[PDB]
C-alpha cells in the first residue's frame, strides 16, 4: 500500500482547531503514525490521542483497520499537555 494524503484536524485542551495534511500508508500502525508526528512536529506519542473512522485509534492498529484508503480521507488528533 502506497502514499496517502491525510486531512487532519488538530486540537488541544483549550485552543482553536487547526488543519494539516500528512503523508501516510494505509498499512502504517498508529504507533508509527504517532512517531512520525513526534519527529516532525515534536508532539510526544504519549500526548497524542487519535480518532480515525469514528473510533479511537490504538497503537498496534493499522490506519487500514480504521478504513484509511485514499487521498483526502480525514483523521482527528487531540493533544494532552504536561
Amino acid at each position: 500500500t502506497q502514499d496517502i494524503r491525510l486531512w487532519v484536524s488538530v486540537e488541544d485542551a483549550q485552543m482553536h482547531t487547526v488543519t494539516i495534511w500528512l503523508t501516510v500508508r494505509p498499512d502504517m500502525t498508529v504507533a508509527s503514525l504517532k512517531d512520525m508526528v513526534f519527529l516532525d512536529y515534536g508532539f510526544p506519542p504519549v500526548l497524542q490521542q487519535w480518532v480515525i473512522g469514528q473510533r479511537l485509534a490504538r497503537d498496534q492498529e493499522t490506519l487500514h483497520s480504521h478504513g484509511v484508503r485514499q487521498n483526502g480521507d480525514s483523521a482527528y488528533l487531540y493533544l494532552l499537555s504536561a
Binding site: 488541544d12 483549550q14 494539516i20 493533544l79 504536561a82
Partner: protein, 146 residues
C-alpha cells in the same frame, strides 16, 4: 556513522574535476556535522558558476516563482545531461508545478510557499512540513505551558 559515509561522498564531489553538481551548502553542512568547518564563501569560489547560473536564469525567466535552490538547479541540470539552456527550462517547469501543489495544499506564495521551497531544495514534503510546523507552533508551545 551513515552520516560520515555521506559526508565522505559529498566531500568527494570536488576532487580535481569531478563532473558533478556540488552544492556548497551540503558540503558546508557535512563538515559542521563532522566537527570542523570551512568558509562557505571559499567553497562557492572553488566550485563552477554552473548551478547558480541555472538558478539565476530560472529566476529571471519567472520572478513570480521566487528564488531557486541549488538542489533544484542540479536536478534539472542532470536531467538535461549538462545541457544548460535545457536545464533552465525544466528547472522552471518543475518549480511551477510545485508552487500550485503547495497552493492546492493550502500554501500559496503569499503564505511563504516560495521561501520554504527554496529553503528545502524544492522538496514539497519538507516544505509542507516546515510550513505546517510554523503554524502548529502555538500548539507545540502549549504542551509545555501551564
Amino acid at each position: 556513522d551513515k552520516m560520515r559515509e555521506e559526508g565522505l561522498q559529498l566531500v568527494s564531489m570536488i576532487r580535481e574535476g569531478e563532473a558533478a553538481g556540488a552544492c556548497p551548502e551540503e558540503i558546508f553542512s557535512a563538515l559542521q556535522y563532522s566537527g570542523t568547518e570551512v568558509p562557505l564563501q571559499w567553497l562557492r569560489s572553488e566550485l563552477p558558476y554552473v548551478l547558480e547560473m541555472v538558478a539565476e536564469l530560472a529566476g529571471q525567466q519567472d520572478p513570480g516563482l521566487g528564488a531557486f535552490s541549488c538542489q533544484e538547479a542540479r536536478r534539472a541540470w542532470l536531467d538535461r545531461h549538462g545541457n544548460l539552456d535545457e536545464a533552465v527550462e525544466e528547472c522552471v517547469r518543475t518549480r511551477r508545478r510545485k508552487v500550485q501543489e503547495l497552493q492546492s495544499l493550502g500554501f500559496g506564495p503569499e503564505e511563504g510557499s516560495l521561501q520554504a521551497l527554496f529553503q528545502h531544495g524544492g522538496d514539497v514534503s519538507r516544505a509542507l512540513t516546515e510550513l505546517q510546523r510554523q503554524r502548529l507552533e502555538p500548539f507545540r508551545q502549549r504542551l509545555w505551558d501551564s
